């Protein structure tokens, strides 16, 4: 997952999500999609942990972002080439919104 060089080491020592905003979609309200998409993708509000910033990196947590393109735009069907992608667990918007 490509990130900029100013991503701090203090993030990468704690058991975080690999993208910027920790998508705690359990912490949003039940059966609601707009506030969960606001928590995940809307970067005008700060995230759940580090309220002094929006995201630890902008190239993974944004909606049109680079890692979002290379991992989320693929959808894990059955009859694909089917190499196991670990970042599909943390980038699939259907799987994020399932919580």
């Amino acid at each position: 997952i490509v990130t900029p060089v100013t991503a701090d080491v203090a993030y990468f020592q704690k058991s975080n999500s690999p993208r910027g905003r920790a998508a705690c979609v359990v912490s949003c309200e039940n059966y609601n999609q707009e506030v969960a998409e606001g928590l995940i993708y809307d970067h005008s509000r700060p995230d759940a942990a580090y309220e002094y910033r929006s995201t630890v990196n902008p190239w993974a947590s944004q909606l049109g972002s680079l890692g979002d393109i290379m991992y989320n735009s693929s959808y894990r069907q059955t009859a694909v080439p089917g190499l196991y992608s670990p970042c599909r667990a943390f980038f699939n918007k259907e799987e994020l919104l399932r919580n």
Binding site: A10, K14, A49, Y50, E51, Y52
Partner: protein, 50 residues
């Protein structure tokens, strides 16, 4: 167990606010004081026009 940073930009929601930049409540708190200061200098308070 995170390591958060309270920089100066997080304090701007409280600091740079017009309640923190008016002297009117201080002057109301000072003019209502029963015992004001007794020195009361008058050297350079105002400029008199020549």
């Amino acid at each position: 167990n995170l390591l958060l940073a309270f920089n100066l930009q997080n304090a701007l929601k409280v600091l740079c606010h017009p309640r923190l930049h008016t002297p009117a409540h201080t002057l109301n708190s000072l003019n209502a004081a029963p015992a004001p200061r007794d020195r009361r200098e008058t050297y350079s308070l105002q400029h008199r026009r020549p």
